[PDB]
Motif scaffolding. Structure first.
Motif, PDB file in Angstrom:
ATOM      1  N   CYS A  20       0.883  -1.195   0.000  1.00 58.34           N
ATOM      2  CA  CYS A  20       0.000   0.000   0.000  1.00 58.34           C
ATOM      3  C   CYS A  20       0.908   1.229   0.000  1.00 58.34           C
ATOM      4  O   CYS A  20       1.812   1.261   0.841  1.00 58.34           O
ATOM      5  CB  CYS A  20      -0.929   0.035   1.215  1.00 58.34           C
ATOM      6  SG  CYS A  20      -2.158   1.359   1.080  1.00 58.34           S
ATOM      7  N   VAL A  49      -0.369   4.245   0.821  1.00 51.98           N
ATOM      8  CA  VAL A  49      -1.055   5.256   1.666  1.00 51.98           C
ATOM      9  C   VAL A  49      -0.772   4.917   3.137  1.00 51.98           C
ATOM     10  O   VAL A  49      -0.216   5.767   3.842  1.00 51.98           O
ATOM     11  CB  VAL A  49      -2.544   5.267   1.291  1.00 51.98           C
ATOM     12  CG1 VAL A  49      -3.361   6.204   2.159  1.00 51.98           C
ATOM     13  CG2 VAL A  49      -2.718   5.637  -0.169  1.00 51.98           C
ATOM     14  N   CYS A  50      -1.113   3.687   3.540  1.00 49.05           N
ATOM     15  CA  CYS A  50      -0.913   3.142   4.899  1.00 49.05           C
ATOM     16  C   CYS A  50       0.589   3.029   5.086  1.00 49.05           C
ATOM     17  O   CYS A  50       1.317   2.738   4.146  1.00 49.05           O
ATOM     18  CB  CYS A  50      -1.595   1.785   5.113  1.00 49.05           C
ATOM     19  SG  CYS A  50      -3.392   1.703   4.772  1.00 49.05           S
ATOM     20  N   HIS A  94      -8.588  -4.406  -0.044  1.00 49.40           N
ATOM     21  CA  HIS A  94      -7.923  -3.096   0.169  1.00 49.40           C
ATOM     22  C   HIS A  94      -7.863  -2.312  -1.148  1.00 49.40           C
ATOM     23  O   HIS A  94      -6.811  -1.818  -1.472  1.00 49.40           O
ATOM     24  CB  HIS A  94      -6.536  -3.317   0.798  1.00 49.40           C
ATOM     25  CG  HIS A  94      -6.017  -2.149   1.569  1.00 49.40           C
ATOM     26  ND1 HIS A  94      -6.412  -1.914   2.871  1.00 49.40           N
ATOM     27  CD2 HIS A  94      -5.174  -1.152   1.227  1.00 49.40           C
ATOM     28  CE1 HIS A  94      -5.779  -0.830   3.303  1.00 49.40           C
ATOM     29  NE2 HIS A  94      -5.020  -0.344   2.312  1.00 49.40           N
ATOM     30  N   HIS A  96      -7.158   2.013  -1.796  1.00 45.51           N
ATOM     31  CA  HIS A  96      -5.842   2.686  -1.712  1.00 45.51           C
ATOM     32  C   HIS A  96      -4.926   2.304  -2.888  1.00 45.51           C
ATOM     33  O   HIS A  96      -4.744   1.111  -3.215  1.00 45.51           O
ATOM     34  CB  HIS A  96      -5.167   2.265  -0.438  1.00 45.51           C
ATOM     35  CG  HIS A  96      -5.453   3.052   0.768  1.00 45.51           C
ATOM     36  ND1 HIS A  96      -4.987   2.629   1.989  1.00 45.51           N
ATOM     37  CD2 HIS A  96      -6.176   4.179   0.963  1.00 45.51           C
ATOM     38  CE1 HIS A  96      -5.421   3.481   2.911  1.00 45.51           C
ATOM     39  NE2 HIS A  96      -6.128   4.463   2.302  1.00 45.51           N
TER      40      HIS A  96
HETATM   41 ZN   LIG Z   1      -3.780   1.266   2.637  1.00 44.76          ZN
END
Ligand SMILES: [Zn+2]
Ligand SMILES: [Zn+2]
Ligand SMILES: [Zn+2]
Ligand SMILES: [Zn+2]
Lengths: 4, 53, 48
Positions: free
Chosen positions: B23, B25-26, B41, B44
């Motif tokens: 990911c 973003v995370c 998920h 994202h």
């Molecule tokens: Zn994420």
């Protein structure tokens, strides 16, 4: 995830 | 296909072998290609890394 | 916005896999599953  | 070292899947808790879907973003979230293929998920943006190096 | 998969020339619905290297190159989730263009890192973009 990282398992460091 | 290679093992991405020290990476665990946040979809199935298995290893990440072949392409790593990390990911963007995370801070610390990753999918194996099976969990990516199932549509986990998808809210994202991710980086798809075919190998560790 | 006219996004066509460069693996199978079909439509890109749900996640778009844009190559990070090759300028105007994208894959559907099937061509990504099948392991086409697997040399290059891709950016995965959610579809609206
Ligand atoms: Zn994420
Ligand atoms: Zn998984
Ligand atoms: Zn490419
Ligand atoms: Zn395709």
């Amino acid at each position: 995830r990282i398992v460091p | 296909n290679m093992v991405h070292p020290n990476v665990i899947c946040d979809g199935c808790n298995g290893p990440v072998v072949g392409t790593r879907y990390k990911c963007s973003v995370c801070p610390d979230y990753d999918l194996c290609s099976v969990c990516e293929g199932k549509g986990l998920h998808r809210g994202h943006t991710k980086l798809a890394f075919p190998s560790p190096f």
